[PDB]
Symmetry: D2
Subunit: 306 residues, 4 copies
RNA sequence: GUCCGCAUGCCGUAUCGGGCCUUGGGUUCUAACCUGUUCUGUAGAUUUAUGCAGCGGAC
RNA sequence: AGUGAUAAACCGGACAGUAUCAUGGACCGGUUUUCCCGGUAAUCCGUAUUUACAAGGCUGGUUUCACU
DNA sequence: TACCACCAAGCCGCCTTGTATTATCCCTC
DNA sequence: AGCTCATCTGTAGGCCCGATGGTGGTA
DNA sequence: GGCCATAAGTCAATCTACAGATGAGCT
DNA sequence: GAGGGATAATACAAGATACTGTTATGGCC
């Protein structure tokens, strides 16, 4: 006795499809609102559905309320990468693509694949990643305006210089807001110190790594976390968080250039005859693994191991 | 019930059994009559009485082993290679640049539980073989036709000699097809029904029989249209993603190829065709769009007329 | 007597290649600095070169000072579209040494084609376009931060809301700076009112149009200004077989093309003469965006027409 | 001197004359033996007895009119169409029509002053035609060979019957080519020089001679390498594919089996070059050495390499 | 010999940007008609090849 | 930077192909959403040959070596 | 003790002209 | 003075150029 | 003097949902 | 009454798997 539910999410609506143990489908549309989420739970209890595994494609942040609602209702929620769903639909031989089809396709995804259960991240983890991605957003905007000074007309410059001062201030404000967040929590304070002990990783990179690694050891292996960033070869897969991947490139250079263990790594690969960026790609992968390793070890970085 | 996947190749087979408990027995074999008997014996050795084998439709290299296991007394499924690739990509994020392993096909078989494959009737195999040979030589004839336009004088003897040969051969095959369909009383009758449709003649009917077959495999005419890849492909999500509808093309190309000129003959110089054309033309559709739609219609009517078992009735349209 | 010079510009260094009437070359590289620009002029006068036609590629802000320098030093300066430059290099050979267009190639471009002479913009024209493109940059960033509010985390919202305020303030400030520019000059003040008289054009669109049309009427026909914005269809007819389909060329300033879209949408919807234009097109098998693309072209063409006429918009003419 | 630009079509012509004073004169003609005789007369109508005519290398529809005007007494230039298009994009940014292109070729002619086109010798034209036909039948013979691999048994009589026909025809042309060569004393000797190179045999010698021709129409051997599209820009590939493809198998036979070829392979292998990069390099070399050997007029000498 | 450890070797070309240039074609002929699908964006998801080598532990 | 010489050295990833596979979204009656059952030669959603085919064109960069 | 300067840097053919298929209807020997 | 509401499949080319972060080494 | 093997054989993340602009008539 | 010729359509994009031949020469018989 286990139902398999599939929810295709939109901004406004929720298309739901319940696959019963007998094999027949029940479907109903709902509003993607706090009210319409309570309507969904009531409609499941209406049909006497107590145990169910619910599958839902990671679709912006429109699925996040209902995923947490159904988790709290006491169901098994799985939030799948939508690339998998796309591939599954093709494997299921489906020609047309509609919302009703997708909700059914997700129900069958749930039954066949039996995906891993989804856990809502800790409030601190959610806060930290929010600040970190906001910080990258301002940096990008600061870089836009900093490029413009190069070829700016003299009537444009007062505006550009003014904007740069604002952006530089706001950037510092967040950096403190981040520091306050990690310093308050005893665990994050300690874990961040461990990351900064790695030569090549500083204030900025340590925050990014904590945002994606989290409080607890959610990864079982170092190579898993490296793969999660899209750093493991397939050429690099690039099948992982781009914000995590981009944050490691400049750490990789200062490591391979101005550290002992970095130059040691650089020279070894240089000997075998690797190009500059190939070595950097490799060092990005290594920094990721070492970062996860240092945290699980729970003791400062030790160069002797490398 | 065990689940087996076979990664077929020209020279080697690669086999992966999945036991009910969940352990993998694996062995490679030669893709030969000997190595097919080795497989059956190896399966029978490990006390594998009932199993569901899944094979990719790679080509003619997988056909003997599929027949061997069918005879041995197993459930053989022969899957569209695109489904296998898509399945591998649904199993992981980074399986794009990877082969579909025998293990993957066993998992495919367990999860999907695909339909059982049936070997075609020897007569159906012969017909489809002749029909695609006929298409092959038409293409070659067309090549040489195009060459006559801009030929040099020293080349023309060679091109003209080839054209004679190709026309003689095309004519020989057309008789060999006619003799095949006439000899069998079922095909003779079913062909006559297809030709009753206005827009469908001697060549198209042979192509339709080659893919419809003796038995009525398709439950609904809709499905035979989908089989040819002639149905539109909807692409809709939320209130933003709005992909324009287009011909799916996810079906037999040999079929889809054969229906275009019929569609053009239908919509142009036929009562029921013009009627269809005008209605869509009024609704504001392009010329080639109307043909694409008529192609789907002909396929759908072709199966409909056979399913009825009576000649084409214009009143129904 | 007339020499043909080509200058291949870079950030730091100039690369000059004189072509003599006889056919021999003179080559000398210079620094791309105020000193090196005066050094260039002296060097040309050194070799008794008073009459010459200089050809430079339009690569941005590194080639502007030297183009000014030579124009003032009494020479015919042509500033060519780099797309023309590359196409010329490919017409000279099939397997060219490099894909780059060197100074020698530019000297040759100048000789064979005798391109049109480049006139330096008026300080006010150059200032107005500077402010207008700055305004469009801040509008883009404002739109970025607007989109973010939709899906923002609550810890992020204070930062986004704060930025939006700054951007909105800056945009108001900059719009006033534009208004004060045009209202000071009696020429620009008059021309702006003539533009705004057109239904579907207001304060923002008028400034963009003035920025690209300028003080004087450089275009002979109004169709040419529509082409300058990249709003004219692109035909691809060849022989009998090769017949494609007409789409917008988009071969022109994006700043103009982006500025006219919402005006066109206002015109066809609310204004009488626009609605009239929409309907006649809509009668034929013409889709919504196709009508907008058409109205965009029309608005540009009317915008120029009105300024050339020198009298406010008159609905009777449409 | 007048600058005339002919835009060619299957049926019609679009002539555009540009006078020294700088005024256009347009007049259409039919692309026929009659309409070519009209053109000659109409030019002499406006007292044009000395002009440079520019026309795109467009199919074979411009071959008669080019031969006509060459015989009439004009400087005919037949330009690569890729150049023409590039020139059109250098003049403007917009629109592509027949009326534009006819006028455009007059401007091309004036500014560029392109090299004069010379009609091939009948034998050069015949040999090329046979060699081109021979490739067409080889490509068809391969199709039917591939088809035997996976053929059904009812198809197999048809495929085998076709192969026999194709093999008979290939053998026939190879003789027709050999007869053409052995008759002409020049081609007979020229081909013998080509075959003397280790790595070039019956097949390749005919292909090379088809594109080199009777006269030494290239100044240097490195020019002929460029004409095949074998020179690095990665290979440009800006040349005859028929000439290019013919050298790949000779290149393998050279680098693998011949003494001078192995030497070449080894030297690049020492520097650390990939398999196909060495083949790419040897293709260029065979082309260069082929032309060199003909210039010399002396059988291949290994010493030089 | 098997299984399990690994911040190990082998494999690895990051992510974002900025500025500037653009003087149609046909017609009943240039503020007319025919021909015309703007310019930019935003957010989220991603758990090993441990595949093969080493090195270590347990039985 | 020209001109002449070059069968040398450096720079070099050719072309053409073949076979095979493919059971719509839905609509119309029941049930009283879908699912499921029955029906579909009708209506709405369709730019064929998941690459249609043919012919033609293509006069190197540099380093040595001479002469300006 | 706060401030400055490096650290890495790949992409791979273009053009111009043409035409066939099949089945049904209409015209001529 | 303020608010709504008009469009919905995707497809121009070229040339000049810069930032990121975290060390070890300066003033 | 007629047959037969055989030399060569790189590629550049994937998805899923979403939004703004400007100017004129209306409120 | 039967056989041959002409016309209908025109912007293009977007699925997978398995596989082969070319030529010329030094090896064989
Ligand atoms: Mg969805």
């Amino acid at each position: 006795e286990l139902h398999y539910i599939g929810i295709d999410t939109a901004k406004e609506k929720l298309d739901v499809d319940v696959l019963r143990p007998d094999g027949r489908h029940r479907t109903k549309k709902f509003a993607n609102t706090t009210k319409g989420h309570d309507e969904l739970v009531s409609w499941l209890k209406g049909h006497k559905i107590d145990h169910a595994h619910i599958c839902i494609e990671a679709t912006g942040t429109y699925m996040e309320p209902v995923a947490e609602c159904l988790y709290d209702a006491g169901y098994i929620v799985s939030v799948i990468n939508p690339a998998l769903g796309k591939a599954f639909a093709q494997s299921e031989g489906l020609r047309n693509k509609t919302d009703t089809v997708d909700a059914r396709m997700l129900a069958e995804f749930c039954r066949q694949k039996r995906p891993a259960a989804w856990e809502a991240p800790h409030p601190l983890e959610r806060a930290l990643r929010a600040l970190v991605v906001r910080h990258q957003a301002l940096t990008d905007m600061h870089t836009q305006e900093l490029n413009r000074t190069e070829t700016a007309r003299e009537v444009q410059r007062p505006s550009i210089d003014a904007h740069l001062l604002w952006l530089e201030a706001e950037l510092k404000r967040l950096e403190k807001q981040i520091k306050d967040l990690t310093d308050d929590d005893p665990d994050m304070k300690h874990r961040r110190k461990l990351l900064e002990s790695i030569p090549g990783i500083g204030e900025k990179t340590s925050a990014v790594l904590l945002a994606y690694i989290g409080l607890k050891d959610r990864f079982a292996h170092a190579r898993q976390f490296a793969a999660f960033a899209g750093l493991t070869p397939r050429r690099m897969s690039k099948a992982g968080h781009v914000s995590l991947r981009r944050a490691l490139y400049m750490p990789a250079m200062v490591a391979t250039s101005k550290t002992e263990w970095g130059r040691a790594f650089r020279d070894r690969l240089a000997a075998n005859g690797k190009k500059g960026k190939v070595i950097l790609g490799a060092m990005m992968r290594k920094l990721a693994q070492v970062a996860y390793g240092v945290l699980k070890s729970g003791v400062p970085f030790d160069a002797s191991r490398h």
